[PDB]
Subunit: 283 residues, 4 copies
């Protein structure tokens, strides 16, 4: 497989610590992110502790020269707790308190907004069919796959972009992976609530015209699907990607109706039937 089932590439890649700070703060794992924020919080409070000590004995009820007492006073100042046992003395420590309160209020507000950004990533909650089918629709062979909304809230302006990716030999003897846009009957669904079957009519303008299971395997053909939409639950845009290889196309298959009948005779959506494909079996 060139592309994984999720649509990402398998190709190995090659060719400063804070050179991409924002990206790294978002993509780094939660234990790493936590260590970074917690360590920065502790390192800043250790730097102010040393600063208070460099002024002399400028913290009331603190043991002279005690870093521990200066650190805990710094925490009480930076977090703006201010119990009042450890309190600043003179213009030097009060100036440092004024600087530290500002750093803590600003820096902890930024750290908290970064936690929120990492936490509020919306997921499309869209299910792609495990396979694609090739069967006749309106008297023409048609490539199909389907999507379902896994949530109760609607996706507005839902778009699907289907692309064929195959190996080709150019007119000047150049071997390369080419990307062919597959024209869909409907690429935009204004309101996506339940199930959507995406169709590519295989006409003389289709890059898979006259193609068989065998010819798709020789060009190492792959089908890449991008779904985009605005999700009403999040009041944000969402996307989902997927990839099918040549062996995931059921030639002559048709998708089973997902709309089932409940015991009370009601019409329901059964996503148990979502990956079910019907085929004709010969002797």
């Amino acid at each position: 497989r060139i592309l994984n089932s999720d649509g990402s590439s398998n190709i190995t890649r090659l060719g400063g610590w804070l050179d991409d700070h924002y990206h790294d703060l978002l993509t780094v794992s939660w234990p790493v992110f936590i260590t970074l924020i917690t360590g920065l919080y502790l390192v800043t409070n250790a730097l102010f502790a040393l600063a208070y000590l460099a002024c002399g004995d400028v913290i009331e009820n603190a043991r002279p020269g005690s870093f521990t007492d200066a650190f805990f006073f710094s925490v009480q100042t930076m977090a703006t707790i201010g119990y009042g046992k450890l309190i600043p003395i003179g213009p030097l420590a009060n100036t440092l308190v004024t600087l530290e309160a500002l750093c803590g209020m600003l820096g902890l507000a930024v750290a908290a907004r970064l936690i929120y950004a990492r936490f509020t990533r919306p997921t499309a909650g869209v299910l792609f069919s495990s396979r694609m089918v090739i069967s006749d629709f309106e008297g023409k062979p048609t490539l199909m796959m389907r999507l379902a909304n896994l949530r109760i809230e609607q996706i507005i302006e839902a778009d699907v972009h289907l692309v064929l990716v195959r190996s080709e030999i150019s007119q000047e003897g150049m071997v390369f992976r080419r990307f062919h846009d597959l024209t869909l009957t409907r690429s935009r669904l204004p309101i996506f609530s339940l199930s959507w079957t995406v169709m590519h009519p295989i006409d003389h303008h289709s890059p898979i015209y006259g193609e068989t299971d065998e010819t798709l395997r020789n060009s190492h053909s792959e089908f890449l699907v991008l779904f985009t939409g605005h999700h009403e639950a999040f009041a944000q845009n969402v996307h989902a990607r997927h990839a099918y290889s040549c062996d995931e196309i059921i030639w002559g298959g048709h998708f089973v109706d997902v709309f089932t009948t409940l015991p009370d005779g009601r019409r329901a959506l059964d996503l148990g039937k979502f990956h079910e494909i019907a085929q004709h079996h010969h002797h």
Copy 2:
């Protein structure tokens, strides 16, 4: 009705606690959201209270072994109030204070940003006409519905996507709901301030060409409308959806002019006339 008047589906659906945390935090009711935040706030302060107690008697002016005194000290630390009656003693409680201040400052900032997200959902403030009409416009039968901006602020790049949804029998005997895009005379209005009448000319390319009130009812025809736009009041995008059934089309009707004359002879917008449709009555 397959689709409700708001554009949602009526179909019954089937086929972990924190498996969709962000969606559930946004879509859950306000009393439930409040119980969750308040309970998490109280449970965290109860966990730190127990932690302070596990260290021994490390809170000044607290009754030894008192959970109540340890809980209220935890609240005073986590909220960063720090009155100074209940104060930490030793390296163990001061370390817990340092950890608790961080959790509270970060966690309460995230909870507050989540309240803001739930509170700042923009509404389009767009009124859809209670009916659609079918009457001649520029010598051609035309399907129409109308929208009005209920607010003083404008919607920029306003888009309308009108779709017919009917039951159909495919060439291979497949019964299914098909979605037909209805081509509008104008689908984009760069600046939407007052009233907008949306028109679908019923020409030989229209899916409702040669269709009558009777034929629309036999295919269980429905009309789905999606409105999108950028709202100047919110400096955010907005949308609105609506649905009409076959019995909500006034055949031969025309919308009444909404621009009324005020006593001072001034031209005004009267949204009292917005749902008024004029029809010819025969003997």
Copy 3:
């Protein structure tokens, strides 16, 4: 004038307190917004003051029954200042402190995020020419207007949508304002840095084909311009709107080159020349 110079409508409009809370919190004036936030802050602290008093004398160093002492203790609790002169006594006041700290931390965080939203509205910083011109370009009469970027930072994917708005009589004797999209030579400028002249070639497909200054005045013709783009300074989308009446079209005029020569022989942009139009004067 039907439409003002800024693109808004002049039409008079007609046809619950917290029924549109979010819109009203954004569009209300700053003195009103401030009164609302400040009053809510003061009313909440007065409600907790009364609550503390209803428990009895549960505030140390407070005068029994004093609302003033209970109010200032509430402020010290809700703002999380906690000096430590006024401190809570018993399980009742400590429970109220726990509730009040939560309300204040959450509610003041939301109020502050609302101030930021009202404060960070981006302006396009785009100058529209005071007039439009009609003159020959590539041997065809062309309608033109121009825009300039007033800032050093670029606007990416800049779009212009020009529309004619005139009064018309329909085939069934209906008088109405019709919106005609005016097709531009270029409606998209990927990178907008300096000046952009927008052109509508008046060909047989133009709604202003065969139109004169006189015929535009009889239909009360107006030209509405919408500019949209992504601003690099804000890393946000921006828009600007404008409107021209029939008397703001210079028939036969051409815009003066804005690129001037500086004393050091350097080529500069002179936005002093931006509204300058050249015309031929006859005897």
Copy 4:
């Protein structure tokens, strides 16, 4: 060069302090931004210090008339530290504390949200080839340039807009820079993971049809590239711009394959080969 390599213009520009506050707060340098926030923090605390003094001796444990003691009490109130040595006396200072806590909580929250906005600007992390090439592709001369994703995370709905910018003489003897959209074989790549070669087939509809290296230099031809896309790492849109002059087009050159073979026989992406162009050398 009219346009720099980054796509910005070189043209010199000409033609109130808080007249563009939000833009200036985002585009101003970090030392300037810090001085502004820090100075505003210090000036506000100096104004409350003076206010407390104007009431008389209304701060316990403060030296009468001492601005230093009133300033540090103001810092302790505005930051909500509240140690409890300097505490307010009477209805006048307690009213000022109530006002100051509100200002500090709101104003410091806004300042912190502004730091976050300045800090969380996403970069596309896209590499443009140092040159463009003109060589035959599918038996037609084709203009090409290429882009690579410098990060592991994908860009979804990646768009490329290529424009020619040359000096031209109009039919009425007008010399001006004209912007020609160059039609690409593929302008949209739904999922951009590795390398993308952008192609403009030079057919009879191309503005560079029949053009040579010499004719492109006489019109001072430049090629402007805009890349846009949605970045999965940031869950935000991104863009990148670039510009090529006439001397940056390798006539007859073709880009070298970036997909290299690793010692374990694995296929890898070598961005060391990204700027490598192959050419035929004659005697």
